[PDB]
Amino acid sequence: AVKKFKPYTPSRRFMTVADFSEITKTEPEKSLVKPLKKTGGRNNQGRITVRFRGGGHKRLYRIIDFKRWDKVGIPAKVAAIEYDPNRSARIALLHYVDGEKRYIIAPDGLQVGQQVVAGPDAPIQVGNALPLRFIPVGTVVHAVELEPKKGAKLARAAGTSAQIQGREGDYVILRLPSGELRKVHGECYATVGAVGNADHKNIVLGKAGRSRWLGRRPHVRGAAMNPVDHPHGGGEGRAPRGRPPASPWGWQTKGLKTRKRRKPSSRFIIARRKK
Amino acid sequence: MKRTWQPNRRKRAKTHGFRARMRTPGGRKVLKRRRQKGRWRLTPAVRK
RNA sequence: GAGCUAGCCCUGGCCAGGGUGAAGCUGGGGUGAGACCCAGUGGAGGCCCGAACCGGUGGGGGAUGCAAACCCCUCGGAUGA
RNA sequence: GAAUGCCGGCAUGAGUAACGAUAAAGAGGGUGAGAAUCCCUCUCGCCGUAAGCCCAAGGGUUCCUACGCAAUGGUCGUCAGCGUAGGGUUAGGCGGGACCUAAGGUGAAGCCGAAAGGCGUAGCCGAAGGGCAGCCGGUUAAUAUUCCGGCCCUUCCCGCAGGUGCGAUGGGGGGACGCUCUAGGCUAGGGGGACCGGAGCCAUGGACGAGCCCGGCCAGAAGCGCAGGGUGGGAGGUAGGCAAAUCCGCCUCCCAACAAGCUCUGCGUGGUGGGGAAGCCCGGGUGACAACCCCCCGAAGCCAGGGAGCCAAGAAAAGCCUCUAAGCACAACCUGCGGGAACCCGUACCGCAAACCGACACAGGUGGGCGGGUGCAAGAGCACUCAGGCGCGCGGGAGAACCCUCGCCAAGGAACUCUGCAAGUUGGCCCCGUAACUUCGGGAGAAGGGGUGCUCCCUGGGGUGAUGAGCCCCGGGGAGCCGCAGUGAACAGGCUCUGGCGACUGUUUACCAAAAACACAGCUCUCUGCGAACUCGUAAGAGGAGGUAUAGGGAGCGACGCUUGCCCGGUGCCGGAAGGUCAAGGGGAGGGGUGCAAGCCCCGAACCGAAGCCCCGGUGAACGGCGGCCGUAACUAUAACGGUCCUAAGGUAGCGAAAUUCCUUGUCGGGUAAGUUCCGACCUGCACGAAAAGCGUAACGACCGGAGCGCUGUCUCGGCGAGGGACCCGGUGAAAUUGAACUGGCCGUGAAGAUGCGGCCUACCCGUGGCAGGACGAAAAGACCCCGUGGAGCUUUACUGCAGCC
RNA sequence: CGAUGUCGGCUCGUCGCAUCCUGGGGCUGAAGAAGGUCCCAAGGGUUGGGCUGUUCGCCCAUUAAAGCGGCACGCGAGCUG
RNA sequence: UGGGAGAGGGUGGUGGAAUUCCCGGAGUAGCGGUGAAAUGCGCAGAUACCGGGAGGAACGCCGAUGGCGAAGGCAGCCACCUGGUCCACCCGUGACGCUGAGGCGCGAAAGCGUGGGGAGCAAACCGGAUUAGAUACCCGGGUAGUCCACGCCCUAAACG
RNA sequence: CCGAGGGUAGGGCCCGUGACUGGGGCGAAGUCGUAACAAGGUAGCUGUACCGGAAGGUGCGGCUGGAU
Ligand SMILES: [Mg+2]
Ligand SMILES: [Mg+2]
Ligand SMILES: [Mg+2]
Ligand SMILES: [Mg+2]
Ligand SMILES: [Mg+2]
Ligand SMILES: [Mg+2]
Ligand SMILES: [Mg+2]
Ligand SMILES: [Mg+2]
Ligand SMILES: [Mg+2]
Ligand SMILES: [Mg+2]
Ligand SMILES: [Mg+2]
Ligand SMILES: [Mg+2]
Ligand SMILES: [Mg+2]
Ligand SMILES: [Mg+2]
Ligand SMILES: [Mg+2]
Ligand SMILES: [Mg+2]
Ligand SMILES: [Mg+2]
Ligand SMILES: [Mg+2]
Ligand SMILES: [Mg+2]
Ligand SMILES: [Mg+2]
Ligand SMILES: [Mg+2]
Ligand SMILES: [Mg+2]
Ligand SMILES: [Mg+2]
Ligand SMILES: [Mg+2]
Ligand SMILES: [Mg+2]
Ligand SMILES: [Mg+2]
Ligand SMILES: [Mg+2]
Ligand SMILES: [Mg+2]
Ligand SMILES: [Mg+2]
Ligand SMILES: [Mg+2]
Ligand SMILES: [Mg+2]
Ligand SMILES: [Mg+2]
Ligand SMILES: [Mg+2]
Ligand SMILES: [Mg+2]
Ligand SMILES: [Mg+2]
Ligand SMILES: [Mg+2]
Ligand SMILES: [Mg+2]
Ligand SMILES: [Mg+2]
Ligand SMILES: [Mg+2]
Ligand SMILES: [Mg+2]
Ligand SMILES: [Mg+2]
Ligand SMILES: [Mg+2]
Ligand SMILES: [Mg+2]
Ligand SMILES: [Mg+2]
Ligand SMILES: [Mg+2]
Ligand SMILES: [Mg+2]
Ligand SMILES: [Mg+2]
Ligand SMILES: [Mg+2]
Ligand SMILES: [Mg+2]
Ligand SMILES: [Mg+2]
Ligand SMILES: [Mg+2]
Ligand SMILES: [Mg+2]
Ligand SMILES: [Mg+2]
Ligand SMILES: [Mg+2]
Ligand SMILES: [Mg+2]
Ligand SMILES: [Mg+2]
Ligand SMILES: [Mg+2]
Ligand SMILES: [Mg+2]
Ligand SMILES: [Mg+2]
Ligand SMILES: [Mg+2]
Ligand SMILES: [Mg+2]
Ligand SMILES: [Mg+2]
Ligand SMILES: [Mg+2]
Ligand SMILES: [Mg+2]
Ligand SMILES: [Mg+2]
Ligand SMILES: [Mg+2]
Ligand SMILES: [Mg+2]
Ligand SMILES: [Mg+2]
Ligand SMILES: [Mg+2]
Ligand SMILES: [Mg+2]
Ligand SMILES: [Mg+2]
Ligand SMILES: [Mg+2]
Ligand SMILES: [Mg+2]
Ligand SMILES: [Mg+2]
Ligand SMILES: [Mg+2]
Ligand SMILES: [Mg+2]
Ligand SMILES: [Mg+2]
Ligand SMILES: [Mg+2]
Ligand SMILES: [Mg+2]
Ligand SMILES: [Mg+2]
Ligand SMILES: [Mg+2]
Ligand SMILES: [Mg+2]
Ligand SMILES: [Mg+2]
Ligand SMILES: [Mg+2]
Ligand SMILES: [Mg+2]
Ligand SMILES: [Mg+2]
Ligand SMILES: [Mg+2]
Ligand SMILES: [Mg+2]
Ligand SMILES: [Mg+2]
Ligand SMILES: [Mg+2]
Ligand SMILES: [Mg+2]
Ligand SMILES: [Mg+2]
Ligand SMILES: [Mg+2]
Ligand SMILES: [Mg+2]
Ligand SMILES: [Mg+2]
Ligand SMILES: [Mg+2]
Ligand SMILES: [Mg+2]
Ligand SMILES: [Mg+2]
Ligand SMILES: [Mg+2]
Ligand SMILES: [Mg+2]
Ligand SMILES: [Mg+2]
Ligand SMILES: [Mg+2]
Ligand SMILES: [Mg+2]
Ligand SMILES: [Mg+2]
Ligand SMILES: [Mg+2]
Ligand SMILES: [Mg+2]
Ligand SMILES: [Mg+2]
Ligand SMILES: [Mg+2]
Ligand SMILES: [Mg+2]
Ligand SMILES: [Mg+2]
Ligand SMILES: [Mg+2]
Ligand SMILES: [Mg+2]
Ligand SMILES: [Mg+2]
Ligand SMILES: [Mg+2]
Ligand SMILES: [Mg+2]
Ligand SMILES: [Mg+2]
Ligand SMILES: [Mg+2]
Ligand SMILES: [Mg+2]
Ligand SMILES: [Mg+2]
Ligand SMILES: [Mg+2]
Ligand SMILES: [Mg+2]
Ligand SMILES: [Mg+2]
Ligand SMILES: [Mg+2]
Ligand SMILES: [Mg+2]
Ligand SMILES: [Mg+2]
Ligand SMILES: [Mg+2]
Ligand SMILES: [Mg+2]
Ligand SMILES: [Mg+2]
Ligand SMILES: [Mg+2]
Ligand SMILES: [Mg+2]
Ligand SMILES: [Mg+2]
Ligand SMILES: [Mg+2]
Ligand SMILES: [Mg+2]
Ligand SMILES: [Mg+2]
Ligand SMILES: [Mg+2]
Ligand SMILES: [Mg+2]
Ligand SMILES: [Mg+2]
Ligand SMILES: [Mg+2]
Ligand SMILES: [Mg+2]
Ligand SMILES: [Mg+2]
Ligand SMILES: [Mg+2]
Ligand SMILES: [Mg+2]
Ligand SMILES: [Mg+2]
Ligand SMILES: [Mg+2]
Ligand SMILES: [Mg+2]
Ligand SMILES: [Mg+2]
Ligand SMILES: [Mg+2]
Ligand SMILES: [Mg+2]
Ligand SMILES: [Mg+2]
Ligand SMILES: [Mg+2]
Ligand SMILES: [Mg+2]
Ligand SMILES: [Mg+2]
Ligand SMILES: [Mg+2]
Ligand SMILES: [Mg+2]
Ligand SMILES: [Mg+2]
Ligand SMILES: [Mg+2]
Ligand SMILES: [Mg+2]
Ligand SMILES: [Mg+2]
Ligand SMILES: [Mg+2]
Ligand SMILES: [Mg+2]
Ligand SMILES: [Mg+2]
Ligand SMILES: [Mg+2]
Ligand SMILES: [Mg+2]
Ligand SMILES: [Mg+2]
Ligand SMILES: [Mg+2]
Ligand SMILES: [Mg+2]
Ligand SMILES: [Mg+2]
Ligand SMILES: [Mg+2]
Ligand SMILES: [Mg+2]
Ligand SMILES: [Mg+2]
Ligand SMILES: [Mg+2]
Ligand SMILES: [Mg+2]
Ligand SMILES: [Mg+2]
Ligand SMILES: [Mg+2]
Ligand SMILES: [Mg+2]
Ligand SMILES: [Mg+2]
Ligand SMILES: [Mg+2]
Ligand SMILES: [Mg+2]
Ligand SMILES: [Mg+2]
Ligand SMILES: [Mg+2]
Ligand SMILES: [Mg+2]
Ligand SMILES: [Mg+2]
Ligand SMILES: [Mg+2]
Ligand SMILES: [Mg+2]
Ligand SMILES: [Mg+2]
Ligand SMILES: [Mg+2]
Ligand SMILES: [Mg+2]
Ligand SMILES: [Mg+2]
Ligand SMILES: [Mg+2]
Ligand SMILES: [Mg+2]
Ligand SMILES: [Mg+2]
Ligand SMILES: [Mg+2]
Ligand SMILES: [Mg+2]
Ligand SMILES: [Mg+2]
Ligand SMILES: [Mg+2]
Ligand SMILES: [Mg+2]
Ligand SMILES: [Mg+2]
Ligand SMILES: [Mg+2]
Ligand SMILES: [Mg+2]
Ligand SMILES: [Mg+2]
Ligand SMILES: [Mg+2]
Ligand SMILES: [Mg+2]
Ligand SMILES: [Mg+2]
Ligand SMILES: [Mg+2]
Ligand SMILES: [Mg+2]
Ligand SMILES: [Mg+2]
Ligand SMILES: [Mg+2]
Ligand SMILES: [Mg+2]
Ligand SMILES: [Mg+2]
Ligand SMILES: [Mg+2]
Ligand SMILES: [Mg+2]
Ligand SMILES: [Mg+2]
Ligand SMILES: [Mg+2]
Ligand SMILES: [Mg+2]
Ligand SMILES: [Mg+2]
Ligand SMILES: [Mg+2]
Ligand SMILES: [Mg+2]
Ligand SMILES: [Mg+2]
Ligand SMILES: [Mg+2]
Ligand SMILES: [Mg+2]
Ligand SMILES: [Mg+2]
Ligand SMILES: [Mg+2]
Ligand SMILES: [Mg+2]
Ligand SMILES: [Mg+2]
Ligand SMILES: [Mg+2]
Ligand SMILES: [Mg+2]
Ligand SMILES: [Mg+2]
Ligand SMILES: [Mg+2]
Ligand SMILES: [Mg+2]
Ligand SMILES: [Mg+2]
Ligand SMILES: [Mg+2]
Ligand SMILES: [Mg+2]
Ligand SMILES: [Mg+2]
Ligand SMILES: [Mg+2]
Ligand SMILES: [Mg+2]
Ligand SMILES: [Mg+2]
Ligand SMILES: [Mg+2]
Ligand SMILES: [Mg+2]
Ligand SMILES: [Mg+2]
Ligand SMILES: [Mg+2]
Ligand SMILES: [Mg+2]
Ligand SMILES: [Mg+2]
Ligand SMILES: [Mg+2]
Ligand SMILES: [Mg+2]
Ligand SMILES: [Mg+2]
Ligand SMILES: [Mg+2]
Ligand SMILES: [Mg+2]
Ligand SMILES: [Mg+2]
Ligand SMILES: [Mg+2]
Ligand SMILES: [Mg+2]
Ligand SMILES: [Mg+2]
Ligand SMILES: [Mg+2]
Ligand SMILES: [Mg+2]
Ligand SMILES: [Mg+2]
Ligand SMILES: [Mg+2]
Ligand SMILES: [Mg+2]
Ligand SMILES: [Mg+2]
Ligand SMILES: [Mg+2]
Ligand SMILES: [Mg+2]
Ligand SMILES: [Mg+2]
Ligand SMILES: [Mg+2]
Ligand SMILES: [Mg+2]
Ligand SMILES: [Mg+2]
Ligand SMILES: [Mg+2]
Ligand SMILES: [Mg+2]
């Protein structure tokens, strides 16, 4: 569920917040957080290269285990579910009978004090990680690597998931969160289940101030600018676009496809995104 | 009202000082020119 | 040249007093169970009044100025973008 | 002799403006050649969340003393932040370094770039963050946590004794963290005392008194006491913490568990060392063997790494602890004790300002801490006042106009004006009470009204004590008293009705615009499968993101409610293995130059040969577009209806003389005595219309219209009064401007608006206070306008390039 | 064009007369009273409101009357904006 | 107490046919549609046929004039959870009953909100026809919706 | 002290009236088309939704009060 407020300010009328119900630990494991070097959208030349960034709440980066084939065979107990400010999904503290402690991203249904394991031999149960070639056809799955041993890269945000669709030799056919149908190497690891915190999308920021807490500086329309700034600049009074709608740098921004048509991965993408 | 000159010794030495000029090709040319003109002060004197 | 100014980054600091009284909690009523209702507790909020502090609304003064943007009266924000 | 020339000198305006906050002065005494201005005393006024004290920047001797007054000081000067000379700044513990890391910077390895240079994990540098051992008093003309005194403490070295597997840049723990609210107990600070100490005082009608006035503490090791912080103990197994490990992490059993225990801090006490008022004696002396005690209030500070709740989820590294590795175990470390040793730099002074930033001793600007008392409900607000500091470096008169800032006003009450601009009114707190509409929060301090001082009597609970008195806090109910008036002074909303625009708090043209503009949650389209798209860079490399489609980029729209129609012919975008056009290149029919030759060289047809365009289709919250004519109904009028030309298709719902309406003050209705504005309608909409969104909408607004009530010098219509100026005398003394001037009116003339020409009229010479009609008055080589084959910003289906992309 | 500030208002006036009123007249289709129309006459007078920036105009309530023009569409080194 | 019949209801799982789309093959001049046609689709390789795949909705035969439910309404199969109802024994209770203004709950379809999902169908719409005209009936397209979750809506020829 | 009432302020109910506007009833001698009663020439009716000059149409589900 999502927490509404009585309208005792103009902004509380619409503000909604997560209920944080799955959370069992309000402090992060000390040996798994490191400082997160806030950038403000500036790069090593100090120049803004991503606009309208900066000024949000201080964060510590929680080290997430995006490999898990790291420790095949070693079971682990789900000791906690925690709040990570660096991602939409929730994180789960794992206590490996090994003694080691790691964070995975918390799947839907993951239970405090359940056991999970990685490997070709793991059961097909929520929180376990296997190479794709051993997960059966049809199961939904998250934390998916794109290439073997390079780390989980697909289906990582709250609520998302991918579904196995069948085997074609060394490769499995996935349906990504976007609807794209892609081949992925069978030795790529994934984790059975979908990502948790699926109510994430239903959250209503409510006020400009909420966006600022998130480090989102206000976005300003090109139509509000001058010709030295933006193709949509100028005009006396309000002005329609008077040209195909365009970015601050001139390229067209309604429909113009932008993936490179010679990119070598094209040989592995079966069907483009649908919606 | 708040004027333009707000003295600050660390800023002065760190921006115009001798070790800042010697860093860059531009800064050395500054020193070369001011030595060629016979300037008594190569660089702003800041108390330290 | 960013010791003015604009943004961001790191690290510190500041915000008298008063008012309103959200959720939750407890008690009671209610019901098959509930919803919900009433009182108490409670202390939320780009919440209210108002100094510091940040502003610069209207008028008046000033106009070889006290001042190359100031002064008086008034007025905006003041836990938050 | 002119260039609004250049440099310099000196004029004119002129004894003119001004002499920099309207907090304020008066007298006596002294010094001196000279005194409103220096020193001293008395009186007066002003700041007191400062206009007082301390600190950090910045300044760099401005500090202290002696001598001095040319210049500096807006006057004066005997004085001074000025001239000269001499003196003055003392640290193991305060601050920085011989410690740590932050962003950032630099940068072994490594990567990139014509060069110069650009990056770059580790490392290093980098603080006002972490860390680390001194408190009180005394002393100097001037330094003091630095010197001295009293009492404490830190590290390094060496030695002794006891103890221990010692040992690290390696492993681990810890350091280590947000916001808001908050408990307990303390301390800083404060108030009272009929109690303790104290020089005195009795006035002018009364008082020799529970009289007045003054003061009644500070630091302190170990112990102890009080309050708090932190921390489970034992054994076994152990595959993880890039070696090892007894440490830590993980599993299991036992015991203890809101306890105590061990530990740490705070406060109190504490051997001891200090301090010590008024008053009157010439900073010092006495007071004084000063006393140094009780009660209340009480922090935002302390215990502290406390507690709760919340979402936006809140640095690092070292010091420290623990673990082991080599090694070494005659060492080494731990603990106690003892002697020795303990470096470099800062320290004066100003510091909300006459010493800093503003050219000035400039009404401006400048970060942190302390900031007393009484009353007003509270408070850092307001009034007065303590401590401390000042009266703002020109004065003395006068009592015009006029200006400024201020007070009041008969009768009227917005009649003022573009506008109630401005100024009145209202104004705190307590009680009563309170409408449309509403998103059920509000609107709301709605509106409106009553209370408010003091005295006596009775009385209810709380805090501290003890349960009581005392103090202190929140009350209640009667009875009276006085004045024009009881938040008696100061600080402190005028209100209502109704349209427009923007949902809202926010942001903006530093220095003419604060808005209806920007932003904003939210909505939609669209791009992006991760070495993402996109952005910066030649590149390396970065951001994006240590993120992964519930994500990131781009665009429009802009809470919310109800909605968002038709047109894909043109442009854009997207899809389309056909076809057409298509460059290099391929291919070489055929043709040429030359050579005696083999040969060399050159041209060149069909055919093959990409993207792009052309072609087919899709696509509107993509660019954009959304008609005209004729005729027809029992009376006129009009046209549901029929016809026809055109188009890609002819504007749907809603709204409409509107932030849009030309005609226009449309017409009708409302309000008014009267209404080019306002509201409500109508619809021939010059020229609304659905995300450059359409129509509404509670709440909000220093936004812009219209009206009413309250109240007013806004006005009829002005009068008086106050202070700072203006005026006069003494001191000091500018400015732009200036062809030269011995510079009147009229009517004419004149390059067409004459002091300067003609005629006539008028007029003795020279100033002071005033007013602004002229000198086409001053200022600025007109911003409008044109001209120049002048410039620059911006646009695009102008031309031609380039990056980028294919 | 090395600048001649530009509408309206407010303030202060001053002038012309082709006269709105008051005074003097002739003609009348002047009975009276009231008008019409021309002549002489510039001495004085020529109101307060609603609307709009407005000039002008219209309207309200009055009036003897509510005149029309010039003075750089009089007057910004006088004000307003 | 002991038995029975049933599309009664809720949650989850799950099986086959068909429709559409995408891919591979093979193949060629039409297909589709109607009362007759045209729009449409198709030499850029359709229709018809074979292989593979994805996805949604509905449940052929059984199926009947049948069964169940208070009504609305309920249909592949499996399990769990749960309601009502009939029978036989005549064992227990001892009039504990009938109705029911108010209240509360349920309430087909369409419609609304938030989010999913979207094959087939199909308001609005666009185009072809038909026709005197044809904003319709017929044809080719086509968006909501139809489906899932949760929250509203509370209507009916909600009828026997 | 209470007190007729008067005064200020803010509320509730009722009535009359209003530029303009919504449909209703009646009028009948008009214009348009022909929705329903026959299978009424697309069986009708229906709740609802969307749309159309008008009657009405269409979708989804329901009824028979439907001819053959
Ligand atoms: Mg809410
Ligand atoms: Mg709430
Ligand atoms: Mg709630
Ligand atoms: Mg709101
Ligand atoms: Mg509100
Ligand atoms: Mg919550
Ligand atoms: Mg959660
Ligand atoms: Mg935390
Ligand atoms: Mg760490
Ligand atoms: Mg990181
Ligand atoms: Mg980062
Ligand atoms: Mg860097
Ligand atoms: Mg930048
Ligand atoms: Mg960007
Ligand atoms: Mg940015
Ligand atoms: Mg942030
Ligand atoms: Mg999270
Ligand atoms: Mg392979
Ligand atoms: Mg959850
Ligand atoms: Mg969430
Ligand atoms: Mg969001
Ligand atoms: Mg955004
Ligand atoms: Mg924007
Ligand atoms: Mg602009
Ligand atoms: Mg620029
Ligand atoms: Mg450009
Ligand atoms: Mg441009
Ligand atoms: Mg434009
Ligand atoms: Mg334009
Ligand atoms: Mg514009
Ligand atoms: Mg425009
Ligand atoms: Mg604009
Ligand atoms: Mg614009
Ligand atoms: Mg705009
Ligand atoms: Mg607009
Ligand atoms: Mg335009
Ligand atoms: Mg546009
Ligand atoms: Mg255009
Ligand atoms: Mg790949
Ligand atoms: Mg500064
Ligand atoms: Mg400095
Ligand atoms: Mg510094
Ligand atoms: Mg600096
Ligand atoms: Mg330097
Ligand atoms: Mg020099
Ligand atoms: Mg020299
Ligand atoms: Mg230099
Ligand atoms: Mg700066
Ligand atoms: Mg910080
Ligand atoms: Mg504050
Ligand atoms: Mg309360
Ligand atoms: Mg609670
Ligand atoms: Mg507020
Ligand atoms: Mg607030
Ligand atoms: Mg300011
Ligand atoms: Mg102002
Ligand atoms: Mg004012
Ligand atoms: Mg004034
Ligand atoms: Mg002025
Ligand atoms: Mg000026
Ligand atoms: Mg001021
Ligand atoms: Mg002021
Ligand atoms: Mg104020
Ligand atoms: Mg306020
Ligand atoms: Mg406040
Ligand atoms: Mg607050
Ligand atoms: Mg705020
Ligand atoms: Mg903040
Ligand atoms: Mg000459
Ligand atoms: Mg000159
Ligand atoms: Mg000159
Ligand atoms: Mg000159
Ligand atoms: Mg010169
Ligand atoms: Mg003069
Ligand atoms: Mg001056
Ligand atoms: Mg002055
Ligand atoms: Mg004053
Ligand atoms: Mg003197
Ligand atoms: Mg003298
Ligand atoms: Mg003196
Ligand atoms: Mg005080
Ligand atoms: Mg200086
Ligand atoms: Mg000196
Ligand atoms: Mg000194
Ligand atoms: Mg002198
Ligand atoms: Mg002198
Ligand atoms: Mg002298
Ligand atoms: Mg001088
Ligand atoms: Mg001076
Ligand atoms: Mg002397
Ligand atoms: Mg001086
Ligand atoms: Mg000396
Ligand atoms: Mg010492
Ligand atoms: Mg050393
Ligand atoms: Mg370091
Ligand atoms: Mg350092
Ligand atoms: Mg430091
Ligand atoms: Mg220190
Ligand atoms: Mg001490
Ligand atoms: Mg000294
Ligand atoms: Mg941390
Ligand atoms: Mg800290
Ligand atoms: Mg905060
Ligand atoms: Mg006190
Ligand atoms: Mg005290
Ligand atoms: Mg007493
Ligand atoms: Mg205690
Ligand atoms: Mg081990
Ligand atoms: Mg003494
Ligand atoms: Mg003595
Ligand atoms: Mg004694
Ligand atoms: Mg506080
Ligand atoms: Mg805590
Ligand atoms: Mg959150
Ligand atoms: Mg670090
Ligand atoms: Mg030991
Ligand atoms: Mg040394
Ligand atoms: Mg030194
Ligand atoms: Mg010192
Ligand atoms: Mg100040
Ligand atoms: Mg200060
Ligand atoms: Mg001074
Ligand atoms: Mg100075
Ligand atoms: Mg001065
Ligand atoms: Mg000053
Ligand atoms: Mg004090
Ligand atoms: Mg008060
Ligand atoms: Mg008060
Ligand atoms: Mg105040
Ligand atoms: Mg006092
Ligand atoms: Mg004075
Ligand atoms: Mg005088
Ligand atoms: Mg009066
Ligand atoms: Mg009035
Ligand atoms: Mg009145
Ligand atoms: Mg007005
Ligand atoms: Mg007041
Ligand atoms: Mg009302
Ligand atoms: Mg309400
Ligand atoms: Mg009131
Ligand atoms: Mg009294
Ligand atoms: Mg106490
Ligand atoms: Mg009084
Ligand atoms: Mg005052
Ligand atoms: Mg107020
Ligand atoms: Mg007012
Ligand atoms: Mg109102
Ligand atoms: Mg609006
Ligand atoms: Mg606004
Ligand atoms: Mg705005
Ligand atoms: Mg908005
Ligand atoms: Mg806003
Ligand atoms: Mg605010
Ligand atoms: Mg401005
Ligand atoms: Mg400006
Ligand atoms: Mg400017
Ligand atoms: Mg400027
Ligand atoms: Mg201004
Ligand atoms: Mg502005
Ligand atoms: Mg504003
Ligand atoms: Mg703006
Ligand atoms: Mg905006
Ligand atoms: Mg929206
Ligand atoms: Mg670039
Ligand atoms: Mg890189
Ligand atoms: Mg990164
Ligand atoms: Mg991302
Ligand atoms: Mg905007
Ligand atoms: Mg909006
Ligand atoms: Mg509504
Ligand atoms: Mg088109
Ligand atoms: Mg097109
Ligand atoms: Mg075009
Ligand atoms: Mg040949
Ligand atoms: Mg659309
Ligand atoms: Mg067009
Ligand atoms: Mg458009
Ligand atoms: Mg139109
Ligand atoms: Mg249409
Ligand atoms: Mg109209
Ligand atoms: Mg009108
Ligand atoms: Mg309108
Ligand atoms: Mg228009
Ligand atoms: Mg026009
Ligand atoms: Mg008009
Ligand atoms: Mg007009
Ligand atoms: Mg009119
Ligand atoms: Mg008219
Ligand atoms: Mg108006
Ligand atoms: Mg107007
Ligand atoms: Mg009309
Ligand atoms: Mg636009
Ligand atoms: Mg506003
Ligand atoms: Mg405003
Ligand atoms: Mg006056
Ligand atoms: Mg007076
Ligand atoms: Mg006076
Ligand atoms: Mg005065
Ligand atoms: Mg006076
Ligand atoms: Mg005289
Ligand atoms: Mg002469
Ligand atoms: Mg003349
Ligand atoms: Mg003359
Ligand atoms: Mg002459
Ligand atoms: Mg002459
Ligand atoms: Mg002559
Ligand atoms: Mg002459
Ligand atoms: Mg004359
Ligand atoms: Mg003059
Ligand atoms: Mg004058
Ligand atoms: Mg002249
Ligand atoms: Mg002139
Ligand atoms: Mg010029
Ligand atoms: Mg020039
Ligand atoms: Mg010129
Ligand atoms: Mg010019
Ligand atoms: Mg011209
Ligand atoms: Mg030319
Ligand atoms: Mg030419
Ligand atoms: Mg150019
Ligand atoms: Mg240029
Ligand atoms: Mg591109
Ligand atoms: Mg000119
Ligand atoms: Mg000139
Ligand atoms: Mg000029
Ligand atoms: Mg006359
Ligand atoms: Mg007669
Ligand atoms: Mg005559
Ligand atoms: Mg006259
Ligand atoms: Mg005259
Ligand atoms: Mg007018
Ligand atoms: Mg005019
Ligand atoms: Mg007019
Ligand atoms: Mg009359
Ligand atoms: Mg008359
Ligand atoms: Mg005139
Ligand atoms: Mg004219
Ligand atoms: Mg003219
Ligand atoms: Mg004029
Ligand atoms: Mg002017
Ligand atoms: Mg004017
Ligand atoms: Mg004028
Ligand atoms: Mg002038
Ligand atoms: Mg003048
Ligand atoms: Mg003049
Ligand atoms: Mg203006
Ligand atoms: Mg072919
Ligand atoms: Mg059947
Ligand atoms: Mg009932
Ligand atoms: Mg229903
Ligand atoms: Mg629906
Ligand atoms: Mg579909
Ligand atoms: Mg037709
Ligand atoms: Mg629809
Ligand atoms: Mg919809
Ligand atoms: Mg039936
Ligand atoms: Mg009465
Ligand atoms: Mg009476
Ligand atoms: Mg029909
Ligand atoms: Mg019919
Ligand atoms: Mg029919
Ligand atoms: Mg219609
Ligand atoms: Mg029609
Ligand atoms: Mg239809
Ligand atoms: Mg039925």
Resolution given for this structure, in angstroms = 2.5
Between the CA of residue A272 and those of A133, A182, A253, what are the distances in Å?
23, 9, 19
Q: How many residues make up chain B in this entry?
A: 48
Q: Side by side, which strands form the sheet with A76-82?
A: A101-105, A91-96, A76-82, A115-116
Query: In the PDB record, what is the listed experimental method?
Result: X-ray
Nucleic strand F near CB of residue A201 (< 7 Å)? yes
The Å distance, Cα A57 to ligand 78 centre, comes to 67
A130, A133, A139, A140 alpha-carbon torsion, rounded to 10°: 70
Can you give the distance from the CA of residue B41 to the C1' of nucleotide D746 in angstroms?
Answer: 77
Look up residue A141 and give its amino acid. V
The Å distance, Cα A51 to ligand 14 centre, comes to 4
d(CA B19, CA A136): 67
Q: Return the DSSP state at A198.
A: G
d(CA A267, CA A253): 27
Query: Contact, A190 vs A152, CB < 8 A?
Result: yes
